[PDB]
Amino acid sequence: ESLLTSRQLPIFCQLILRIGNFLNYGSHTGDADGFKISTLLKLTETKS
Amino acid sequence: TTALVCDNGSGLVKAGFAGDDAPRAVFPSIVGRPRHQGVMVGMGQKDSYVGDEAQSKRGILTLKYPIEHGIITNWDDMEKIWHHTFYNELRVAPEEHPTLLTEAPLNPKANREKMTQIMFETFNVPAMYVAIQAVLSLYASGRTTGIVLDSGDGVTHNVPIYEGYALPHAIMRLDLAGRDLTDYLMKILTERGYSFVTTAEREIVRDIKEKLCYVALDFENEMATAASSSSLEKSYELPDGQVITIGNERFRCPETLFQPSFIGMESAGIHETTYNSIMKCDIDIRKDLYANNVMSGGTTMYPGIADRMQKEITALAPSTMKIKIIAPPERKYSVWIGGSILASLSTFQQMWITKQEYDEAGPSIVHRKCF
Amino acid sequence: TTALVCDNGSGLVKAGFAGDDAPRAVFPSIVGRPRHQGVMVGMGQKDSYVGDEAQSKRGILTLKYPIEHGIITNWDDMEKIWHHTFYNELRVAPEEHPTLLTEAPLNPKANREKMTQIMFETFNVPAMYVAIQAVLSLYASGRTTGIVLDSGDGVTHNVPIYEGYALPHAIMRLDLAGRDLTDYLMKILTERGYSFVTTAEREIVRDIKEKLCYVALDFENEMATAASSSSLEKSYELPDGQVITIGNERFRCPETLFQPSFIGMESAGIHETTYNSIMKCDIDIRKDLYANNVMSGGTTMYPGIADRMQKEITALAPSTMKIKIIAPPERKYSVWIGGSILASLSTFQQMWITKQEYDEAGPSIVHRKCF
Amino acid sequence: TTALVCDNGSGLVKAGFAGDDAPRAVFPSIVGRPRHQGVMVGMGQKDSYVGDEAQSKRGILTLKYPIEHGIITNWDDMEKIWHHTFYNELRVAPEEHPTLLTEAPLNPKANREKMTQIMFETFNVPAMYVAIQAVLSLYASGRTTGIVLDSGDGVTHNVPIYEGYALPHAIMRLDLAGRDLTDYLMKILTERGYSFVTTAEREIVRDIKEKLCYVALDFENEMATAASSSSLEKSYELPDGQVITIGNERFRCPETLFQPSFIGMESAGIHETTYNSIMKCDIDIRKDLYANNVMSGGTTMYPGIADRMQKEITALAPSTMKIKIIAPPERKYSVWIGGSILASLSTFQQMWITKQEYDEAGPSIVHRKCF
Amino acid sequence: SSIERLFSFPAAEPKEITFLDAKKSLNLNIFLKQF
Numbered sequence A: 001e002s003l004l005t006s007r008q009l010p011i012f013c014q015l016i017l018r019i020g021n022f023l024n025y026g027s028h029t030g031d032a033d034g035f036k037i038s039t040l041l042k043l044t045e046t047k048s
Numbered sequence B, C, D: 001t002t003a004l005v006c007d008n009g010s011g012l013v014k015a016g017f018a019g020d021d022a023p024r025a026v027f028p029s030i031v032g033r034p035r036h037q038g039v040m041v042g043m044g045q046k047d048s049y050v051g052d053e054a055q056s057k058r059g060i061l062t063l064k065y066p067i068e069h070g071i072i073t074n075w076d077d078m079e080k081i082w083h084h085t086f087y088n089e090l091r092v093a094p095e096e097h098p099t100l101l102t103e104a105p106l107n108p109k110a111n112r113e114k115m116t117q118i119m120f121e122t123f124n125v126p127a128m129y130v131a132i133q134a135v136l137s138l139y140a141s142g143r144t145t146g147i148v149l150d151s152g153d154g155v156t157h158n159v160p161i162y163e164g165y166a167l168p169h170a171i172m173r174l175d176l177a178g179r180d181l182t183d184y185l186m187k188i189l190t191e192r193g194y195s196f197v198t199t200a201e202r203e204i205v206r207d208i209k210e211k212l213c214y215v216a217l218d219f220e221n222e223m224a225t226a227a228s229s230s231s232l233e234k235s236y237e238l239p240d241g242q243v244i245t246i247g248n249e250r251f252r253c254p255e256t257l258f259q260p261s262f263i264g265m266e267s268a269g270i271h272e273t274t275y276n277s278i279m280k281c282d283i284d285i286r287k288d289l290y291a292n293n294v295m296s297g298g299t300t301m302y303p304g305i306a307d308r309m310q311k312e313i314t315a316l317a318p319s320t321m322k323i324k325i326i327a328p329p330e331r332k333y334s335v336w337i338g339g340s341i342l343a344s345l346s347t348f349q350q351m352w353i354t355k356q357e358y359d360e361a362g363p364s365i366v367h368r369k370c371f
Numbered sequence E: 001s002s003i004e005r006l007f008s009f010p011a012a013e014p015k016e017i018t019f020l021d022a023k024k025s026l027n028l029n030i031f032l033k034q035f
């Protein structure tokens, strides 16, 4: 029910979708309307 | 342009330049962290010792293996291993040299995703390649076909390849190799009263295993000989100056390779794994695999393993056809030698993985490109 | 803003600046009070003489040592010791100078709290650091690894350090040094008829111990030679002009360091403490610690002690490995010299205990900022 | 006849007759040799005090423990211990009474050989048996299966047992028990200034540990509470009448069981040893083992250890599954009590080692007849 | 702008006229290279 009523997680995945769609521009994974659950564990892979 | 061959094995990373015979940089894959307190201010007390420095100063270092059971578990440690093997050992820029790498069979795909992303985002290369270790070992044996039992530090896997076609269903994997033999050797040395509990002591017991252990040709006769006469006892000098003497532990430790019930595993020995790999092949091509039993990995360095292996397969297989064991003396580095063979080929220019392929197809073109 | 190093040892306070070679002010730590009746009015009668003034006029003074076995007992006397070494010996304001104090390991923590409270509230500083003396001895030796046996006047302690890392479980402390040797030298000097009971006579027996005693290479043969022939006997002139002659007491006095059962203590000698400290260390680093035995402290000024330490450890160690006793000629002040090296280190500026940090953390940061 | 149970433990020997619930002769395993000079004539005073006699007169005795980490060091002292418990405490002839012995897992086998040789030659018995202590601890609980964490005075070992069969490969050993906690408590009482250096003082520190120490449920909160207010401070009266007060050392001392890095051991705590012992077993037999933690040993008397054990295991375990810590109140004597249970059965009579079996098979049937 | 500042890349006879396919030529080259 907490996952059903989580409001901040749509806002978070919208921000991650905007950042990823900026990041993978010019690749086949760009212009994505969504992603899987396992994107969150792969967030720390792209390092500065 | 000279390529680089770098087998990132579970035990020791073996790297060097392509087109050569021997790897220039052989060093164990450990990350050593100090567990005590520093009091001496200055002189470059670096917080994480990698490789040979971690081996030399190991008496104050908790040692961690980034590759456990052929799987890269810790990733930052593996990045430190790659940084040391490129910048400190070879001292070459990655952006001007191709880098061949190796991998275990039946690996997870996301492992290949992560290795591709590290080899194209952090350590940028012009090109790179991931190959199966058994395939490169068969290439360094000079034969296109054959069955390879590769036994490293964590994985003993059987792979039969017929005419370059590596059969996927017949590949199997047994999680019993050199580190398990070292842990069992720690366990059985306590019967003689020698205690080895720390990770620093694992290198000493591993050196004992490398220097003194050997595969028995018959186990029960070696029990009878060891219990009867103390002729096979051998002495070893520890780094603190103490001298131990070991008896049957020279051949009870590799016998776990043939009897996994010592450490409590229900699966049988590597011979039954080889034989059950052989029945998974077609009946036409089984004859070629019997005469082409190739070994690789340093767990096959014990100087009684070939005749015992031929005895075990000849007991298992029907005796109507020929059994032959391919055991070259340089089969420790045959993964690296096969990589050096494969890197300097004129055809191999068109199977390179470019940065343009990486940018077009993510870190995922390695699945559709390689086997 | 230069730095002060003030080794507040049990016997001899050694203080000086940072970067200097030899310690500027070396004077014994005694507070002397008059015990007879002053009859001659005027003359500026001090209620307490501190230092060399108490040493010179010692025939009419009860002398008290404020530090006993590295633990400061009388805090007013130690306040007067600090007042003398700042305002009369070095003639420096401590409000414009940092201070490095030395401390024996395994000390009471309330002692460290009280030197923190006095040194930041009575003689308030910009900064102060309390450091272990053995690390300073290894600083002055210049080598990074090594085991350090430091034997002052009250504390004989072993601290082993490998490649910049101390091992706190292998640190051991023994309350047996030169004050107990002075008391035992009195107790064996009563055999020849010479009586010494007062606090002034401790200085005379201490001077006898400094000037005439020596460590025997073999105790039993030296006993047989001194019992047989009167060649080892030596004469010393007292301050009243009388001449004493001592024989075996030249080498029965320091042998308490190798045989502590003379004064009834149960523990074994300093060589056994060194060997047990090395066996308490990890097995890889004992090769470095055998080759780098660093002695320090004024108790090791006896001119036979290095050969005896080498002989005892080479008896105890395995014979496949070299023992080397590092004994510099200036090892009395090596605690001070390594303190002056440490205070001149540019890296050491970041771990000063500031007055700001003392105010924000109470007298409790000295457990966490120091070792 | 009536059998004997003699748990020859590392710190205390618990002997008594079979069929009984209370051990008749519980006495510490020490040998007290005099060190000072006797001046009485009249003889009477022995050269070696054994047991409670050494405890009573401990102020003039060097105390030697014959057993160190479950290994009998001095066999003459342990022979004196056996002679005292056979002839003075229990007062039985050894050659007319069966006698059950206990032994720790993963011992050197020559220790078992020498115990067999002494019990069949010096104190020759009609029969004997050597058995694993954790098995007898489980037999005291009235259950057939479960895991026993036996934490004695030298060895803390985890043994899982399924259907009366102790699984050999999953048994683990940790050389950290009550003597090391006593040494660490002796180390940390110097912070408050209470010095303890003699072997007699180790019994006083052990009595402090027995009467006042306890396992914290949450270690960091107990740090915060003891550092905040003096509520957990408790006072103890010494044999000379001095009163000490200890605070956090009541629960810094048993926390070495859950954090072995306090005394420099690299290995993990007893909860991790329990968990990794259970993951070394098969999955299907795990259902008995989490629900049947049967703690034993004298170190497990601290009155917060069951809840801390349940908390740490339930943190470690998968959450779908019951954790039950069966901590009986008499689990100190559960080795002896279970020995009386096993020795008072008609089914055990065929399992004895007769003298005839010793004569045909040497002192080596104990590796074969006894598991 | 910050993402392009931080996470951007810091990098700003061919024909052999073989009638055979790549597989048999590769097997032949690996077979030839052992000599």
Ligand SMILES: Nc1ncnc2c1ncn2[C@@H]1O[C@H](COP(=O)(O)OP(=O)(O)O)[C@@H](O)[C@H]1O
Pocket: B008, B009, B010, B011, B012, B013, B151, B152, B153, B154, B178, B179, B206, B209, B210, B211, B296, B297, B298, B299, B300, B301, B302, B332
């Ligand atoms: N001379 C030797 N004798 C016995 N065993 C060896 C010898 N040399 C190496 N080994 C063992 O084999 C392993 C060799 O590593 P290798 O197979 O080259 O890569 P990895 O095992 O890391 O995949 C080491 O872990 C070592 O324990």
Ligand SMILES: Nc1ncnc2c1ncn2[C@@H]1O[C@H](COP(=O)(O)OP(=O)(O)O)[C@@H](O)[C@H]1O
Pocket: C007, C008, C009, C010, C011, C012, C013, C014, C151, C152, C153, C154, C178, C179, C206, C209, C210, C211, C297, C298, C299, C301, C302, C332
């Ligand atoms: N030449 C000497 N020979 C023998 N012993 C000496 C000599 N000089 C000093 N000592 C002893 O060493 C002690 C000095 O050591 P030190 O570390 O300076 O003590 P502290 O610093 O505690 O005053 C003195 O107490 C003295 O007993």
Ligand SMILES: Nc1ncnc2c1ncn2[C@@H]1O[C@H](COP(=O)(O)OP(=O)(O)O)[C@@H](O)[C@H]1O
Pocket: D007, D008, D009, D010, D011, D012, D013, D151, D152, D153, D154, D155, D178, D179, D206, D209, D210, D211, D297, D298, D299, D300, D301, D302, D332
């Ligand atoms: N009431 C107690 N509280 C805390 N510790 C105890 C208590 N009783 C015994 N011990 C500890 O247990 C040790 C004895 O354990 P024991 O069960 O005899 O082990 P073992 O049989 O292996 O010697 C003693 O040394 C003591 O330190």
Ligand SMILES: [Mg+2]
Pocket: B007, B008, B009, B010, B011, B012, B152, B153, B297
């Ligand atoms: Mg390998």
Ligand SMILES: [Mg+2]
Pocket: C009, C010, C011, C012, C151, C152, C153, C154, C297, C298
């Ligand atoms: Mg001194």
Ligand SMILES: [Mg+2]
Pocket: D009, D010, D133, D151, D152, D153, D297, D298, D335
């Ligand atoms: Mg016990």
